[PDB]
Subunit: 364 residues, 4 copies
Amino acid sequence: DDLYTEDQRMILDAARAFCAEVLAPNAAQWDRESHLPDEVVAQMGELGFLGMIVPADWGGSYTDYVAYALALEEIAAGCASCATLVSVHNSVGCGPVLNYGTTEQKERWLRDLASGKTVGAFSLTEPHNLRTRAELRDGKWILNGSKQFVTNGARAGLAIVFAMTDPDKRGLSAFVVPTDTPGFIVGKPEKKMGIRASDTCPITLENCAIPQENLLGKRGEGLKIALSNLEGGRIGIAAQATGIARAAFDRARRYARERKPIAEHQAIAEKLANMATQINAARLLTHHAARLRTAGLPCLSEASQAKLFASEMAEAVCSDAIQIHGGYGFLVDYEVERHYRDARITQIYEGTSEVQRMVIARQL
Amino acid sequence: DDLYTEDQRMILDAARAFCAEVLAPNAAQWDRESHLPDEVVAQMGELGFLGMIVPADWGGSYTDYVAYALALEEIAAGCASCATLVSVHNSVGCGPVLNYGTTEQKERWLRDLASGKTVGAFSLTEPHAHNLRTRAELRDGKWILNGSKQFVTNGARAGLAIVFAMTDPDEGKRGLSAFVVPTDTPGFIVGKPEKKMGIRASDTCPITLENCAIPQENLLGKRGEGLKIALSNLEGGRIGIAAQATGIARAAFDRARRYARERVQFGKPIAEHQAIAEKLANMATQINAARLLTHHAARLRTAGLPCLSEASQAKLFASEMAEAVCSDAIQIHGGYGFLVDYEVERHYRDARITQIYEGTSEVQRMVIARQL
Amino acid sequence: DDLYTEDQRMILDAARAFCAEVLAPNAAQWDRESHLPDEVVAQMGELGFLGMIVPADWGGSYTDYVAYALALEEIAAGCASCATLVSVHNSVGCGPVLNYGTTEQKERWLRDLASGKTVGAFSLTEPHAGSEAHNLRTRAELRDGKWILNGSKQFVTNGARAGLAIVFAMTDPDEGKRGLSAFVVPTDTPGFIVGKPEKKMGIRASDTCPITLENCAIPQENLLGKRGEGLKIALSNLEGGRIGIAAQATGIARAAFDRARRYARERVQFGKPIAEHQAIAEKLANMATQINAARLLTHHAARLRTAGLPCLSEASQAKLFASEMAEAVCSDAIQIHGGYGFLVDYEVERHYRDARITQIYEGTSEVQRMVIARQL
Amino acid sequence: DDLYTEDQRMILDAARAFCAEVLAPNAAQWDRESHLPDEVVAQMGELGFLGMIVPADWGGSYTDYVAYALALEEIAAGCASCATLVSVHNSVGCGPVLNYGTTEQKERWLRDLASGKTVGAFSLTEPHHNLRTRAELRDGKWILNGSKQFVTNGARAGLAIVFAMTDPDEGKRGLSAFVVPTDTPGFIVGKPEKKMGIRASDTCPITLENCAIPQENLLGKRGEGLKIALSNLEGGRIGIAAQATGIARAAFDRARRYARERVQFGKPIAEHQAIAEKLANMATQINAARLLTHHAARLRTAGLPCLSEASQAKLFASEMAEAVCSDAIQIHGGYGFLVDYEVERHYRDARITQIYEGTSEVQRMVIARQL
Ligand SMILES: Cc1cc2c(cc1C)N(C[C@H](O)[C@H](O)[C@H](O)COP(=O)(O)OP(=O)(O)OC[C@H]1O[C@@H](n3cnc4c(N)ncnc43)[C@H](O)[C@@H]1O)c1[nH]c(=O)[nH]c(=O)c1N2
């Protein structure tokens, strides 16, 4: 930990101890029951894990993005579903309100988002850019449409919902929708291969009317807003891939050392060497992008490179962790099978690998 | 199909029909409930799938190994757990009895294995880290077995197990013997099925032998021949798992390519995107190569030629490929690929075991290298 | 071998002897001099390797395509450059004349192509146009009873040694994809100007030449097929071409692997033959497995083609797979050799250099993928 | 660059200018002739490139190891052979004398090594730790006999750090290190080896036949030879990591420019998704390789343990370089296989990085050992 700053090493310690004491012993159960207890979410709130990229005067704990990634790496090593909840809540639950909310808006919502009292959700994508619509009639914005894969959909108190307001690029607007609003209809959580305890829900909007002052930004600023947190999001998920890969690697190398022991059979040792090299490269790409972002510099390509690299790495590293365990690797009680299922999603959400490659290439 | 013989196409069509009518629509449920219905196993019996490498003379359906491979690829595309059952039963349930059994032993057990009335299992490996701790002592005209075995596929539904034990500890490599143990023999204790990431409906159980006393005539082959017997269906087992890996990959590939033709993003079917197209071509290439390696091994095996390397190449290749094709199949589905209801996530989970069992990839590589 | 037919074993035996006696011992020198002696090309002629896909009654030696792939793999295992020459001459030198030639045109040319008295070249690619092979700027105009070719061509294999070239030219510039025509052009024709062979990383003894056509006049009866049929003709030997390159990749890789496995048995490090080191043994096992899959893809495409069945996909899969496999196999061979792997005298560096072209010519990997995907 | 330091940016900018004006225009010709012009070596010396990990007090230009890695990357991108010479000279030419030499020894040789006046070589391995080359103390001199293998800079070096058995029966603690002037009678340098790549980096066998040197040329203590042989592994590996990053980067830069110029089916080929995907993968792996390499250098700069980290950088960069060079070939199509388009030289040069300064297999052993 010698190369990190003092802020960064403090977050790392706090994160480490939380993860060892609360996440790691319970993640198997949470996966098996597809459910993360709310008191664990609340406790993440109290510790500042749900406002790590909100400034401290708005109720958060932001220091820099390297710290953020270190915390999300630790949290993902303990529980990949927690890391999903946290990466989404901080980046796209908190980000839009902080960056485009008026002062009154931030007073209404941001301190509760940043403290974790209110969990946040972001809803842009749709089953088939958009067909969800919002009409302004009699002082209320009225939303009708259908939305897909909303992380934190069941538990969020607020949702940033994107909707077509003016059908002729600047045709979308963003809304803060409290999730108890009549006509905000959240469906049953999707059944997923992995991150099973991170609730991922479809949402139907059926004349969901919200006050006019719940418009977020100016009318027509929807797309820009939806795109304002790609760097933070991708950095977050790259950090998550790194943590999940690292957890499986930690188990593999512990199993190799105990099962001479198999860690000095050439082939096993080569896998472990490869796994360590790849995990460390993923971390360094993640941190490099986080430094640029901390400094306010352009870093979409760098963040997309981290997310790309870390995500693909993680599936291969988790696959080696299984292989190193033999027959036991396929068994639930040995946990690496969980890490393998959890890892897979990182290549898909927050921009697919194909999208990550498009943007990196665009800028060469 | 016009590339295959008459017999082969017939076995292929019979299995296609069974997988479409019975397996494919119910796989998802069986994965969900971690259980294959006894009657579906009995129906594979009735159809000859549980005797495909047993001569017709002994009640089986043997034509050749390519045909075996074709049937297993089809079963696997519909239900990976079914393929596991079928492949283990046929190769290591039926094989030891067929090759090493006396005539009377073949009459007492082989007809029922081949018909599928008796499901067979095979138990050599043990849960500690050749050098077995499980023992057999000859006492008053009976073999008495004491031991603990690990991961017996078909462990719960098998009526017979081939069970290997130390009979002569001084003799080392010739220290082992093989025994046919009816699973209802007192002292044959089946534990709870293991909880696995995939092939969840294939029962995999630890077993203990506790003063498990069996008739002297249940010794399979000669005393001390157990190792040799334990190693004599490696070719067949490995051919079948390579076929299974091929079928699993093919199911996910078929779902993904159909999805890529129907799904529209950026104003064209996604199969018209170059990156997607490249995955689809790589998938088809790798599946075809895996099938070609498998059938080449099968062809050598059918002609009684030595083929342990060719069988191991095919199993190594098909197993590694199946993970990469299934991963690609998930990716082409985007977020839907991660969803249970889109099924490719089941194919991925199921395929991962193929690199491990029937000899790990590491073991496969060792034999292939040994002959180079 | 037991799985092959008597014709297949016969050609296989013949190629093997030739490759040990003539090719393998001299290949290093030819790479070094960037030159294949004419007497070696004549011997391949005499032995029937330049007619392996022309029927016997036209002077060829065609039995089936599996035989062809076996012969090409051997030839390639001894000299990659030689395999390039053979593959091109057979598929696109002979093929166009065989398939589209009149009786008179086959009597004039195909017996000499099939015996190897005359080496064949194929010229389509231009400086601006490779993978997009239809937009041609080379032109052909009828004046005074002769076809007059003017233009510029690129990367012609066998370009300096060939006696005939199948040249593709725009006869009808406003007719697009139906505007190409194919022409048999004697390479001694005035205005058929062969540039100096390209300097390449690998297959350095396979002459690969630019060609300038300048008031290059030929008899009217050197038109091959119907006017406008050029594109169809240019695309009519894809399967055979790709089968042969797949077999070439397989043979180059095999040669690298044979050296590596022998060296790993002999070389000792940390008290045993490095072959017994598990990481080495794994590399060896992966190399065998991949070469074997390549071969089986190639022979499967060869069977469909022998039966006249459609097989462009299967041929493209073999080519893609073999070519990419060969790079990784030759790379493993280098690594198994340690620091000796980088040295010219240890040969495997040459196989690595030679292997790399197989992913590019006879349709790039990207093109192979497009056609495999399209036919799903 | 914003993220580098004033010294880092300083050495980077100088390496850039110099790669661009001297190295990159002439690298093809040097590869073709298998020869680096002496005056170019002298310019590297003069510019401080041959003293980059020796302190300023001893005639060097040492700032930190991140600066070293940046400069090696740039040199490598203009001329892989020059980078091989530079990496070796700094790491194992200067390193032993710097760290194990007496003050008298450092005054005698280290300043000339650091200024580039004298180029240094290092000679441990033989054709077959268990070594045949012997040194015998006789009449106030060490007399060396043996055969040595693949000495980089073997034909231009003025001094060679040679390792020999002083005490055959003490095994690993029976080796000693010696500073040998290369003009010493009985120091016979054979013909440079014929190689696939880095052809202008001279790589020579050396025969020592009754090669007699002063008693005071023992380096470190008698028996300390293996420890000295292993004392610059970190530096060496960081250097080759930077080499591999640079070679790949050169091929990458050519391929990405080509892709924006070459049109096929109506658009620049960089806009075909399959090419874009290659370019994106090349950029990402190259950056990953630099970041591993700089991470290692930071640990080295701070004097912290970093053998594994440098081994990870060297392993990752070297394997990466082959794959990136291969893509660069592919992106060029047929042109990629032609000498005039340069990417085929980069691919050839890149392949050595997986083998020397320890094979991939050796890198992976040290990484594993330490987990
Ligand atoms: C040694 C040797 C020998 C021969 C030949 C080449 C060489 C190097 N060829 C020519 C060969 O067929 C040619 O190199 C390929 O068609 C590739 O074309 P270019 O080199 O013009 O690359 P080109 O400019 O077409 O492509 C550059 C890169 O972009 C990619 N690309 C192009 N279009 C694309 C698309 N739509 N989507 C995705 N990617 C795309 C390609 O795959 C390639 O990777 C030939 N020719 C001949 O007529 N007669 C002969 O005998 C020979 N022999």
